[PDB]
Write a protein that binds this DNA or RNA. Structure first.
Lengths: 100, 70, 91, 117, 178
RNA sequence: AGGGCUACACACGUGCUACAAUGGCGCAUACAAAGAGAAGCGACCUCGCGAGAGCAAGCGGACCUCAUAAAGUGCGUCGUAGUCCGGAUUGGAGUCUGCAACUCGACUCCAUGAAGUCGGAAUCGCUAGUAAUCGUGGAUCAGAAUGCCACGGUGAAUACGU
């Protein structure tokens, strides 16, 4: 279960908006190829410590229903066991047994 | 002197007055003040950021967002 | 193969500690846990004490090591030698 | 006709044949043939020695194996004398580019050793 | 050789002025340089003796006798006695040939060196120059691939102080210690 | 925040890809299916050595893209020598997602280059679109697929007998 994975999910959305919105194209503008003989200044790229938790790299989410770790599926907000459980009682729209 | 056994004298007895014209007569730093690594210490010499070829396009000073365009 | 791609790094974290340390010439080991971070001109003749996950290791910075990370000098893993396995119980 | 002897493979088509002079993989050999006035698909046995000369002068610019392998010896030694993780992994022979250790250790780490079970 | 008629003509007057000595002869010269190349071991094998001979040959062509210890009770390793050094003495015209190639081509050969402390001179101003390796002047079959075999370059002198010892190879510009 | 499962000494399990030539190499040459793409991909664009790249109209996917589908086809070439198969290692440069890419991340590419010549004990699925073998797409998915999941290419021996 753990409260830490639910606490994380809540913490990321104010901090996505707060750090990240100003920073969106800023990795490309100040650092990558778009900085050809323009920017390339350390003093404008030392600012990417602040978005560190708000990163595309920490949107691993896990379950919204239970907060349960490991084996996640974004398309349900669920995992293997917990999908099957909701599916058994017909709670997921469009979901049927597969035959072909 | 055991004369015969001695190898040739071609640049040995020759030009006991010679310059630094192609190679030094004494070296600096061979007495090791620092240990020699045979490496050049990068990012002290050379750049923290690479050559910028590929994707050379006039810069846009205003924010853009990959899911944010429709 | 791996690189550091295209941007310019000095680390934000190393900047405040270094700025006050360089003014003295040298001062007491700077408590760093940020071992992902690379070494730079600014840091030369200082002593960065490098968290390795268990404890800090003091790393002396000098011109030949600016091509490297703090984590490169500072260990992580243990290599188990291979003469013989431990066999037996102890009474 | 052998470019330099000791190992050139006799009567092979020309792109593959030059991968035993070293400094010359398939790509470098394709430009060398076109430059010298050689078709890719003749076998090497079809060439007179004065075609071998013309071909050979375009082989000769590239790095020789004796210098190649000294650079890579000194490259591994330079890191190994610093004690950075690059250098630490060279000492033992273990992977530096993220590769596994867990199995199939015989070609690098040698003969089987006792493991209690 | 070319060197010594020139050292007589140029350096002996330099030294004569520079120290304000009372005789032209009070000035130091180089006397025979014996070497060692104290290699050790190979008591039956003589292969490490053959590699030490091909390194000495570069600088002075004469045959190593390979000296052995006379009593065998010393603090060195004993096993069937021991062979150690070579000599391969530089003497007369061979010595005069040598002293111009030393500094000028022997230091440019050397890349890793721990010798030449200024305090260590004693006695006569006699010295032995620990160069850590073979100082290869041009030779046939020096190369057989080996390691270590730096040598004592054991200089001797008609110099009778430490500073008159240190006034050899001074018309060669080398950075010697104070 | 940093380190770690994927450690490493080996053994053991599994799958991939190989040990060949049914193939690899060079130059020329062909037709997919099915689906996925508001952390995402993306025409046009200019930059790039192929790949890629950054910019951006844009998308809802029978529209545009991933995607250059690969094995296979044509000619010449090669004979069990680790090669004309296999390409790991490793040095270097160009590119990427991110404070950060060294051990635990990705993509392209140049040079050289080891293990392995179908494996004693051990060891399983399979009755026909099956087994075999090749590529592709997808769920997950910052950046990692040999796995798993579905799809399409080419596609076998025999089932007497208990």
């Amino acid at each position: 279960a753990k409260q830490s994975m639910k606490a994380r999910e809540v913490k990321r959305v104010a901090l996505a908006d707060k750090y990240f919105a100003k920073r969106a194209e800023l990795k490309a503008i100040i650092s990558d190829v778009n900085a050809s003989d323009e920017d390339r200044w350390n003093a404008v790229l030392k600012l990417q410590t602040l978005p560190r938790d708000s990163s595309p790299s920490r949107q691993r989410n896990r379950c919204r229903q239970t907060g349960r770790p490991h084996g996640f599926l974004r398309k349900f907000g669920l995992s293997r066991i917990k999908v099957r459980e909701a599916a058994m009682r017909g709670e997921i729209p469009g979901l049927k047994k597969a035959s072909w | 002197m055991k004369k015969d056994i001695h190898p040739k004298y071609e640049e040995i007895t020759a030009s006991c007055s010679c310059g630094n014209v192609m190679k030094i007569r004494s070296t600096v730093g061979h007495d090791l003040n620092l240990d020699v690594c045979s490496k050049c210490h990068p990012f002290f010499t050379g750049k923290q950021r690479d050559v910028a070829t590929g994707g050379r396009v006039d810069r846009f000073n205003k924010r853009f967002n990959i899911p944010g365009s429709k | 193969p791996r690189s550091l791609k295209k941007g310019p790094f000095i680390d934000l974290h190393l900047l405040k500690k270094v700025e006050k340390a360089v003014e003295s010439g040298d001062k007491k080991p700077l408590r760093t846990w940020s071992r992902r971070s690379t070494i730079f001109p600014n840091m030369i003749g200082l002593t960065i004490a490098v968290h390795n996950g268990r404890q800090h290791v003091p790393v002396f910075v000098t011109d030949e090591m600016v091509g490297h990370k703090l984590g490169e000098f500072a260990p992580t893993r243990t290599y188990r030698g291979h003469a013989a396995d431990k066999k037996a119980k102890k009474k | 006709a052998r470019i330099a002897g000791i190992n050139i493979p006799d009567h092979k088509h020309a792109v593959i044949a030059l991968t035993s002079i070293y400094g010359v993989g398939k790509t470098r050999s394709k430009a060398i043939l076109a430059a010298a006035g050689i078709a890719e698909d003749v076998k090497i046995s079809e060439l007179s020695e004065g075609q071998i000369d013309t071909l050979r002068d375009e082989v000769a610019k590239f790095v020789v194996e004796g210098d190649l392998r000294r650079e890579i010896s000194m490259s591994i030694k330079r890191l190994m004398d610093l004690g950075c993780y690059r250098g630490l992994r060279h000492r033992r022979g273990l992977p530096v580019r993220g590769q596994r250790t867990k199995t199939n250790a015989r070609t690098r780490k040698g003969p089987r050793k006792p493991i209690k079970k | 050789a070319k060197l010594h008629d020139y050292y007589k003509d140029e350096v002996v007057k330099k030294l004569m002025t520079e120290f304000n000595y009372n005789s032209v002869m009070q000035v130091p010269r180089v006397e025979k340089i014996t070497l060692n190349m104290g290699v050790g071991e190979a008591i039956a094998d003589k292969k490490l003796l053959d590699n030490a001979a091909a390194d000495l040959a570069a600088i002075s062509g004469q045959k190593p006798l390979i000296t052995k210890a006379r009593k065998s009770v010393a603090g060195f390793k004993i096993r069937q006695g021991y062979p150690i050094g070579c000599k391969v003495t530089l003497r007369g015209e061979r010595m005069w040939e040598f002293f111009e190639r030393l500094i000028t081509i022997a230091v440019p050969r050397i890349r890793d060196f721990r010798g030449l402390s200024a305090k260590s001179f004693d006695g006569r101003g006699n010295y032995s120059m620990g160069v850590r390796e073979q100082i290869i002047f041009p030779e046939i079959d020096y190369d057989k691939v080996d390691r270590v075999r730096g040598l004592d370059i054991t200089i001797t002198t008609t110099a009778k102080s430490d500073e008159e010892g240190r006034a050899l190879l001074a018309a060669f510009d080398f950075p010697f210690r104070k």
